[PDB]
Design a protein around this nucleic acid. Structure first.
Lengths: 206, 86, 195, 164
RNA sequence: GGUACCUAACCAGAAAGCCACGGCUAACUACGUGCCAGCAGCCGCGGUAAUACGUAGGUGGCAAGCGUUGUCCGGAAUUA
RNA sequence: GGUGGUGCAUGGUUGUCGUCAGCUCGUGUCGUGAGAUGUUGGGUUAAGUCCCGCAACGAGCGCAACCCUUGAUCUUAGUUG
RNA sequence: AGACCAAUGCCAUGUACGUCGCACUCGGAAGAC
């Protein structure tokens, strides 16, 4: 079938687990706890865009950092909503939590945000050509070494699904020394389901 | 929290692209909230004028801004257009 | 409502007024507001033909026939056509300002008259002969809409002439420029009907 | 003799043409398109391009169009004389029509002629009806037309005895 | 033939339809149907998500006419 | 709420040729166009691997390497060895 | 230059097309020493 995921291949050799803590004999419920907390932030902060979240379990008290740049408004006058969401987190996790927010510079070349973007104007009904083409030029203007974008599904032609891509530069997936960042997002429209995948090559790792 | 930043009270947006700018005016509004500014301004161009009318509609449907207004005679007239937030 | 629907079907108001485009500029029909394909090399000039058709309201066999009379006329093949519609008498009562819509014009020329070189005119063919003094009375001189026509100033151009008290005027020596072309994309007519 | 791209030039797409390649994996799909360019007064070219997608396809065509142009002589907003087009079963008749007649041509020949900005001309398709062979035959036609003054120069005469 | 004409008064009331909407070729959607019922000038559409069938709306074109058929000439440089 | 159908509406998945060395593009030439040239020729390699030629010049996905393990040794640390 | 191989059931297979960049204002009294 397909390839393996580049970042799944690169986990542990170039990439972090973003769950850096260790559990033993509480691994299970700890693990499903990281799943539902990720679900909570994912469908709460979907407006302000989140890419990835790192969970720390220092002295079993959970500790969170959240990435990306648009939550600069979450950091700002919305210290109240930061406190409220954190109160809901301690409502969900028993033992309390502490959260931090990390700004991301060049949020254009982060795969999660790219995929969420393409899913958004695919819901907003721009042509997939226009969406992919402006996004790819925006990333390689930002300084990415090479970007390939995917789309699949009923691309207007509901009677037969197909797939479309554009890519330039270099995207060496076969080289494990490369830094790759992968996203998938699922654009839902009246036609059914439209699939978005995107991955970014950003130079090698010495 | 992030604390390495300072945010300016104005911005000049002359002589560049539409869909390049609106990515970084949304970022600039988010920066102004982090510094808690009640008022900001984005100086624009004259000739093509597409972004000059183009940005103001985005702030009208933006989730954080209530209004965008032109300048007064005591400030210099149309030399500034002002924006205020929620 | 003819005028409104055809204004948005057409993209331009046929009356020349700004309304009927001010909040429905796209099209009629449920598939109006979508972005449309550019019109074809038959669509564009049929569309232009419908401009020139319904901003008078005249029909197609009359179109083809006055087209042939324009062709038989010794001037250039297209501007003779538009000046013949200029000389069509409901256009004459429009640009003399008595009529405010051409649906007012046709109804009123059914009602009233012009006695310039006539006795009673119901049909828009003729032209003012230069140098005669016959004038309109009673049936288009003293009634209620008669002064409602010239209660306001509407522009009467150079190839026409007008006075307002008895509300009558004549075709002058020659029509030249705006009468040649107000805004009309000409020669699409001649290529359409010459297909 | 080559005219540079210092002028402003209008473009007009006449045909996007589906093209295909058969390979071991199956059929492979490509897009050719040809366009005609020029000015309304005296200079005209055309261009062809091949690409997998419409916009950069017509872009390749339009750079080839910016590369190649040809001048057309113009004696009183119409062509001077008789000329038949001739290239590879492409036969296009051009007759110096009188004034006020407008353009009378088929699809692609009108598409090149109005982009040449010639007022009054009439024509006929006598060769095959493929558009590229049309345009090639027509520009081979207007390449052949000459002014009266240079013919008088070749004669060692003036223009009066040749107009009369 | 008391015809047309000429006058007065009553009533916005007595009076618009046909065909097309895949392309050629102007006009798109919903439902039903499901190689069945069917459409068709040509290319062709329909084998359960049919802008091509049949309905409804909407649009388009023309109008006291509108479509179909038959015949003649063009398009047809296709007897040149 | 449907493990009530429709992979011939689909996303996300997976096998297969095949770990085969192929697959393509930008720009430029030639043809008119379909297309070609690059990618063919000489030699070489597990390999479109490389070299020399050559109206092509380059580029990308490929290939190789970069990762893990297994093979030989140095230093660090000697416990629950 | 060298043996012998017969057949493969009606339809129907795809898409393609669609960007748009440029701004800041004008000017009273002032001695002699």
């Amino acid at each position: 079938g397909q390839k393996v995921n580049p970042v799944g291949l690169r986990i542990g050799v170039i990439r972090d687990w973003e769950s850096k803590w260790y559990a033993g004999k509480d691994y299970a419920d700890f693990l499903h706890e990281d799943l539902k907390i990720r679900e909570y932030i994912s469908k709460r902060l979907s407006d302000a865009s989140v890419s990835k979240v790192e969970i720390e379990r220092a002295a079993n008290r959970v500790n969170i950092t959240i990435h990306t740049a648009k939550p600069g408004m979450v950091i700002g006058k919305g210290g109240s909503e930061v406190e409220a969401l954190r109160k809901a987190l301690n409502s969900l996790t028993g033992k309390r939590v502490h959260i931090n927010i990390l700004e991301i510079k060049r949020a254009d070349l982060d795969a999660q945000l790219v995929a969420d973007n393409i899913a958004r104007q695919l819901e907003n009904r721009v042509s997939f050509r226009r969406a992919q083409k402006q996004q790819i030029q925006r990333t390689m203007r930002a300084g990415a070494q090479g970007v390939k974008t995917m789309v699949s599904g009923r691309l207007g032609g509901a009677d037969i699904a197909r797939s479309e891509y554009y890519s330039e530069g270099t995207v060496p997936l076969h080289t494990l020394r490369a830094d790759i960042d992968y996203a998938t997002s699922e654009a839902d429209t009246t036609y059914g389901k439209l699939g978005v995948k995107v991955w970014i090559y950003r130079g090698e790792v010495l | 929290k992030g604390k390495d930043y300072h945010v300016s009270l104005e911005l000049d947006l002359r002589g560049e692209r539409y869909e390049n700018a609106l990515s970084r005016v949304e970022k600039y509004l988010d920066d102004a909230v982090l510094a808690g500014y009640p008022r900001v301004s984005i100086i624009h161009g004259k000739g093509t004028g597409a972004l000059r009318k183009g940005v103001q509609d985005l702030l009208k449907n933006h989730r954080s801004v209530k209004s965008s207004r032109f300048g007064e005679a005591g400030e210099g007239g149309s030399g500034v257009t002002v924006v205020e937030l929620k | 409502g003819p005028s409104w629907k055809l204004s948005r079907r057409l993209g331009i108001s046929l009356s020349g007024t700004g309304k009927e485009l001010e909040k429905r500029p796209y099209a009629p029909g449920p598939h109006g507001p979508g972005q449309r394909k550019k019109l074809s090399e038959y669509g564009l000039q049929l569309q232009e033909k419908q401009k020139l058709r319904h901003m008078y309201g005249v029909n197609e066999r009359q179109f083809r026939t006055l087209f042939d009379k324009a062709g038989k006329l010794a001037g250039k093949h297209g501007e003779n056509f538009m000046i013949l519609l200029d000389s069509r008498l409901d256009n004459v009562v429009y640009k003399l300002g008595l009529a405010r819509t051409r649906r007012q014009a046709r109804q009123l020329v059914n009602h009233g008259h012009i006695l310039v070189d006539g006795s009673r005119v119901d049909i828009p063919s003729y032209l003012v002969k230069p140098g005669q003094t016959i004038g309109v009375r009673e049936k288009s001189r003293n009634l209620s809409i008669i002064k409602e026509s010239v209660e306001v100033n509407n522009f009467v151009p150079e190839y026409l002439t007008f006075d307002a008290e008895k509300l009558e005027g004549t075709f002058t020596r020659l029509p030249e420029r705006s009468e040649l072309a107000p805004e009309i994309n000409e020669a699409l007519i001649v290529e359409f009907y010459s297909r | 003799r080559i005219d540079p791209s210092k002028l402003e030039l209008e473009e007009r797409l006449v045909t996007v043409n589906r093209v295909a390649k058969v390979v071991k994996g199956g059929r492979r799909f490509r897009f050719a398109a040809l366009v005609v360019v020029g000015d309304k007064n005296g200079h005209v070219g055309f261009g062809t391009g091949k690409a997998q997608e419409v916009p950069e396809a017509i872009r390749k065509a339009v750079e080839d169009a910016k590369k190649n142009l040809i001048e057309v002589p113009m004696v009183g907003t119409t062509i001077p004389h008789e000329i038949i087009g001739r290239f590879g079963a492409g036969n296009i008749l051009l007759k110096p029509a009188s004034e006020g007649t407008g353009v009378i041509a088929g699809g692609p020949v009108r598409a090149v002629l109005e982009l040449a900005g010639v007022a009054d001309i009439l024509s006929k398709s006598l060769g095959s009806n493929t558009p590229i062979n049309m345009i090639r035959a027509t520009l081979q036609g207007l390449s052949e037309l000459k002014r009266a003054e240079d013919v008088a120069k070749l004669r060692g005469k003036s223009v009066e005895e040749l107009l009369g």
